[PDB]
RNA sequence: GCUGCGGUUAAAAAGCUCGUAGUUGGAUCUAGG
RNA sequence: AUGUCUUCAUUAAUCAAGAACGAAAGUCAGAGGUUCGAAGGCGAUUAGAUACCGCCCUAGUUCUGACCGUAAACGAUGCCAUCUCGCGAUUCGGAGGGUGCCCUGCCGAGGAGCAUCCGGAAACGAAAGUCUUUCGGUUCCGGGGGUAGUAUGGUUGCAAAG
């Protein structure tokens, strides 16, 4: 539960980047 | 383990070339953007003009202000 | 032991060794003349027979297949062949 | 042994073995003791026992100074046998616990420099075997069918687990050492200064 | 000096006069006076003194470890290590340990067998933890192609010409020296064809000079 | 560092083992890993067997027993002291402790 | 080892195990050298000063084959039938 | 408390070993003999030694005590060791009807033996 | 799948020698194995060996003299010329005084000394010392 | 790192299997005198 | 797997690309909805408590038909062949005896355990051994720590994402 939350954070950031680029 | 057959020269050479790209030195020297990224463009010396002067806080545990100039 | 005669192994060991791991391979099976009380016809039969060997005209079952050596029917004796 | 008929196994000698049950080794067997076993308990080969006993006797006699031969045992049954063997053969005896460092610690006042070491049981006296392995001291040992032969030079197959067989085997070793030394002879028997050395002397007596 | 062992008694009585019989019979040596008496040309050197610390309740307890290499430059070399509270005592104990650990080294020829042996008989590899040292024969005049630490040990052992290949954490002085020591002492354990000839076992010194020992 | 040769379980020749719910905490633990104990006890405590016997309505009545197979997860087992931590050497000892 | 113009300039020739023919190192302390006294068949007394020497290396001794190795060596030399 | 230190224990052991004859079961007697046989620098120490000596004597009377060598006890032990019966229990005279199992199949035959006394069960 | 009977045989010999055994059994035999063992015999690194026939590849039983440090196979069978024979020997053998490098030439199977004397190259087979 | 590295825990065995290209493939033909 | 004096006769091992299967969660459609239960809402505890604890519960958890293709998917150890030790137990089949059970230092095939050469930085490993004495065949992977499995491009997917 330390790097898994980093993965979750990065996934949220990637989702936001996808929404912005779209 | 690595291949050892008498007719595996292609595989050995191709694998070695492929894995050379995972080497920091080889990649640094053959990447292709070295000239564009390096300020001196591959030279040893360069000339410039002064703009301002700054003091940089030396890293811990050293305490001092090193006196550099922006060129 | 360090000194073991591999060339001439002990016969008891050779008998109690796996058929493929002997100095020279040899099957553990054999052919036998089966004699069944009655028609008294000697019939050659394989020890580990997998089919049901039948009398020629005597028309009776001599052996029954199993997982190992064939099981001779009751009342039938057998003698190994050289 | 020796390729001679005068040193062969004698009728009464083999008799004593069956009398004392010195041929019934334990039900566990060692691949290194496959040799001294003829076909519950495992019955050992009396001829091989005799030959190994003679070989051990010759090895011990090779030590011209009897004190240098050291006999070590910790089994309670073997204390009488060890004391009698030491007295008769002029050897040195170690009873009970073997203090670690006898053979490796030169500063110890218990320090000894045996030229030859004899053991009642390798497993019981494992410490002595390990210590001898540091100074290169040859080891003879009374070993049962399941005993380990690691670092054992001459293993005399016998029933060292028994109550009476151990005493009989120690008595036989002393007898052959003295026979081959000249203090006694086969015909006269085990006698010194006119006193009959009887196996029951070595046999274990319960207090 | 009052010997406390049979070997020491024999050496003091001069019934054993060279280290060669001791090595032949594989008799353990437990008194450095034996080596002192049987090798009068030994010279020693302190390879390194390094402090080691043990954490305790009231700080760190510091003891110094000394590595010493002794040799005669004529085929006998030994390596000792001693850790003690003081550098002087550590050095003395390391010298004693090296003396007790002195071991024989076999020399050989690279090509033509003319003159005295100068190099190792064959390629010999020694190891200690991670440091592995391989000694390879070299022709005359080559010198010792090696790092300083193995070079010192080879000089003490008397090898004049030798190539070296060292691998692992060679910065560990102790392990480097011990690997070199193991490689050097492998020389008289490697079985080459010239030692195939069967020899006859002779009486050990204990067997031969037993009269004085008993007396 | 690997603490145990068996990796804290009893799983050999097996891919997946169904789990059990710990008797105390309720946590899911693999059946091989969970510590099991079979407790057979008198239905009445030793201090009241005599009272129940004297109050019995029958000349000779055998008092029944409770049989419970309890599974504990590692945490609750340690907390309840069904098992204890052992030295490095004593960890390899597999014989059940004296009862 | 022979070398030079025919001279031997080895420090010493090491012993070899009587059973496996392996060199016995100067620091092989698990090796042993057993001696058996010679006996004349009839009287059964040791001949003074006469013995047979056997050396067994530490590797074999530790492997536990020293027993059988000594027995086989004695059988070869006739000390045992 | 009342645990005797190694000093007292060693002194008592040495005194018992060297002057067993003078050591009786009486504390006053042990104190007196200690006074003349040992130079002890403290009266409490002397009394502790005497008390432990009496305690040790009480056990010596019951039986041998490890760490203490007593002349008479060792004579008794060596007599028990030297005990030797009139005739061997393994003499062929006594060995008459020994019951042996089938091990005789060849163990006592290929060896070249035909023991009359052995009886195969 | 077995692909180098010689490699397996030399591995078995090496293991037996390290364990100190007096005889070792080599599974499927072959002419190459026989010639390798014959060269080792001529050079005295093994005792006599007996080829057990069983109407198949057969077996060998070799007597070990306890004199072999190592017997190894070089795979694949590289081509060695007379000019680099010296380099290969210096690379593979412990010393110039002993140890042999086995080649397979047209003249047959020999050691590097015989190959040099006859001025022959060929394919490398293995080495022992 | 072909000679010549490493992949349980330090970086590194694909979740597992089938499979084309590639790579590698058991013993056996004239030995002797 | 075992048994086989049955048949073919090299037909084999490993495998870029390619393909099947692939826990749980998750998505789509249709049935079911007991239990438990993300999210949600309350009662507690706390300085706060968007938590641990308790109560009521929605998706889900179940089935059918399709997607995704990821797990500490672990033995953190690729597959095939071979050699090196001891002991006694265990599952399956066989052989020989005795009365389903017992015996055979019985034979193979598994799955382990403790006596273990050698190996390893060590922990430890009958393999992680038979390697500077390197070299049986073959596939994949690593090259100081981060930036970062991120940006960009490509591709698959309904999406999440791979």
TrEMBL record, chain I:
Instruction: Write out the entry's keywords from A to Z.
Output: Ribonucleoprotein, Ribosomal protein
Q: Which Pfam families match?
A: Ribosomal_S8
Listed under GO cellular component are: cytosolic small ribosomal subunit
One GO molecular-function annotation for this sequence?
structural constituent of ribosome
Q: Which GO biological process annotations does it have?
A: cytoplasmic translation; determination of adult lifespan
What InterPro entries has UniProt attached to this entry? Ribosomal_uS8, Ribosomal_uS8_CS, Ribosomal_uS8_sf
User: Record's family?
Assistant: Belongs to the universal ribosomal protein uS8 family.
Q: What is this protein called?
A: Ribosomal Protein, Small subunit
Q: Which organism is it from?
A: Caenorhabditis elegans
């Amino acid at each position: 539960m330390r790097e898994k939350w980093r993965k979750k954070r990065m996934r949220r950031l990637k989702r936001k980047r996808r929404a912005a680029k779209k | 383990g690595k291949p050892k057959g008498l007719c595996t020269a292609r595989k050995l050479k191709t694998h070695r070339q492929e894995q050379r790209w995972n080497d920091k030195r080889y990649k640094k020297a053959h990447i292709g953007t070295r000239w564009k990224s390096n300020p001196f463009g591959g030279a040893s010396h360069a000339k410039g003009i002064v703009l301002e002067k700054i003091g940089v806080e030396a890293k811990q545990p050293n305490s001092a202000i090193r006196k550099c100039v922006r060129v | 032991p360090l000194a073991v005669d591999l060339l001439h192994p002990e016969p008891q060991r050779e008998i109690r060794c796996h058929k493929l791991k002997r100095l020279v391979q040899h099957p553990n099976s054999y052919f036998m003349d089966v004699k069944c009380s009655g028609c008294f016809k000697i019939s050659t039969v394989f020890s580990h027979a997998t089919t049901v060997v039948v009398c020629v005209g005597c028309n009776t079952v001599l052996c029954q297949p199993t997982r190992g050596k064939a099981k001779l029917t009751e009342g039938c004796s057998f003698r190994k062949k050289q | 042994s020796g390729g001679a008929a005068h040193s062969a196994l004698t009728e009464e000698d083999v008799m004593k073995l069956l009398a004392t049950q010195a041929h019934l080794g334990s039900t566990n067997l060692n691949f290194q003791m496959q040799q001294y076993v003829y076909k519950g308990p495992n019955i050992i080969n009396v001829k091989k026992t005799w030959e190994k006993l003679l070989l051990a006797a010759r090895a011990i006699a090779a030590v011209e100074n009897p004190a240098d031969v050291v006999v070590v045992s910790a089994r309670p049954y073997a204390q009488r046998a060890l004391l009698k063997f030491a007295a008769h053969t002029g050897a040195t005896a170690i009873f009970g616990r073997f203090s670690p460092g006898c053979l490796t610690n030169q500063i110890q006042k218990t320090f000894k420099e045996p030229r030859l070491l004899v053991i009642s049981d390798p497993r019981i006296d494992h410490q002595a075997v390990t210590e001898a392995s540091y100074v290169g001291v040859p080891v003879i040992s009374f070993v049962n069918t399941e005993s380990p032969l690691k670092l054992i030079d001459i293993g005399v197959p016998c029933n060292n687990k028994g109550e009476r067989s151990i005493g009989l085997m120690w008595w036989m070793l002393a007898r052959e050492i003295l026979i081959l030394r000249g203090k006694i002879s086969r015909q006269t028997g085990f006698v010194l200064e006119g006193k009959e050395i009887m196996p029951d002397l070595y046999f274990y007596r319960d207090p | 000096w009052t010997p406390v062992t049979k070997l020491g008694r024999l050496v003091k009585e001069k019934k054993i006069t060279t280290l060669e019989e001791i090595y032949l019979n594989s008799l353990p040596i437990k008194e450095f006076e034996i080596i002192d008496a049987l090798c009068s040309n030994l010279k020693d050197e302190v390879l390194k003194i390094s402090p080691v610390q043990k954490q305790t309740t009231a700080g760190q307890r510091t003891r110094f470890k000394a590595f010493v290499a002794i040799g005669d430059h004529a085929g006998h070399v030994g390596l000792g290590v001693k850790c003690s509270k003081e550098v002087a005592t550590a050095i003395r104990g390391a010298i004693v340990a090296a003396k007790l650990a002195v071991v024989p080294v076999r020399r050989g020829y690279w090509g033509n067998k003319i003159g005295l042996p100068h190099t190792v008989p064959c390629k010999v590899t020694g190891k200690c933890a991670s440091v592995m040292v391989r000694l390879i024969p070299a022709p005359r005049g080559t010198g010792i192609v090696s790092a300083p630490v193995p070079k010192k040990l080879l000089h003490m052992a008397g090898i004049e010409d030798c190539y070296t290949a060292a691998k692992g954490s060679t910065a560990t002085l102790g392990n480097f020296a011990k690997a070199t020591y193991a490689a050097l002492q492998r020389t008289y354990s490697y079985l080459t064809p010239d030692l195939w000839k069967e020899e006859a076992l002779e009486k050990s010194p204990y067997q031969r000079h037993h009269e004085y020992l008993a007396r | 560092t690997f603490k145990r040769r068996n990796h804290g379980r009893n799983k050999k020749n097996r891919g997946h083992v169904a789990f059990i719910r710990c008797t105390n905490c309720g946590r899911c633990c693999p059946k091989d890993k969970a510590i099991k104990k079979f407790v057979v006890r008198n239905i009445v405590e030793a201090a009241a067997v005599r009272d129940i016997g004297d109050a019995s309505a029958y000349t000779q009545y055998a008092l029944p027993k409770l049989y419970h197979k309890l599974h504990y997860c590692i945490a609750c087992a340690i907390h309840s002291k069904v098992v204890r931590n052992r030295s490095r050497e004593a960890r390899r000892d597999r014989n059940p402790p004296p009862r | 080892m022979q070398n030079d113009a025919g001279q031997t300039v080895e420090l010493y020739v090491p012993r070899k195990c009587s059973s496996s023919n392996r060199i016995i190192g100067p620091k092989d302390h698990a090796s042993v050298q057993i001696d058996f006294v010679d006996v004349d068949p009839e009287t059964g007394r040791m001949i003074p000063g006469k013995s047979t020497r056997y050396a067994i290396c530490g590797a074999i001794r530790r492997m536990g084959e020293s027993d059988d190795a000594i027995l086989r060596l004695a059988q070869k030399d006739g000390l045992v039938p | 408390s009342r645990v005797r230190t190694k000093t007292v224990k060693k002194a008592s052991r040495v005194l018992i070993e060297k002057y067993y004859t003078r050591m009786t079961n009486d504390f006053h007697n042990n104190k007196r003999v200690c006074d003349e046989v040992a130079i002890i620098g403290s009266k409490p120490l002397r009394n502790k030694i005497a008390g432990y000596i009496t305690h040790l004597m009480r056990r010596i009377e019951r039986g041998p005590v490890r760490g203490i060598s007593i002349k008479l006890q060792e004579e008794e032990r060596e007599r028990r060791d030297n005990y030797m019966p009139e005739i061997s229990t393994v003499d062929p005279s006594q060995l008459t009807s020994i019951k042996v199992d089938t091990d005789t199949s060849d163990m006592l035959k290929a060896a070249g033996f035909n023991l009359p006394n052995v009886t195969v069960e | 799948v077995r692909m180098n009977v010689l490699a397996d045989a030399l591995n078995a010999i090496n293991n037996a020698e390290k364990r100190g055994k007096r005889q070792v059994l080599i599974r499927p035999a072959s002419k190459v194995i026989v010639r390798f063992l014959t060269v080792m015999m001529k050079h005295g690194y093994i005792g006599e060996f007996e080829i057990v026939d069983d109407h198949r590849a057969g077996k060998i039983v070799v007597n070990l003299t306890g004199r072999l440090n190592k017997a190894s196979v070089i795979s694949p069978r590289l081509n060695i010329r007379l000019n680099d024979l010296e380099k290969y020997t210096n690379t593979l053998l412990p010393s110039r005084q002993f140890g042999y490098l086995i080649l397979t030439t047209s003249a047959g199977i020999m050691d590097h000394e015989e190959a040099r004397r006859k001025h022959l190259g060929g394919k490398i087979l293995g080495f022992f010392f």
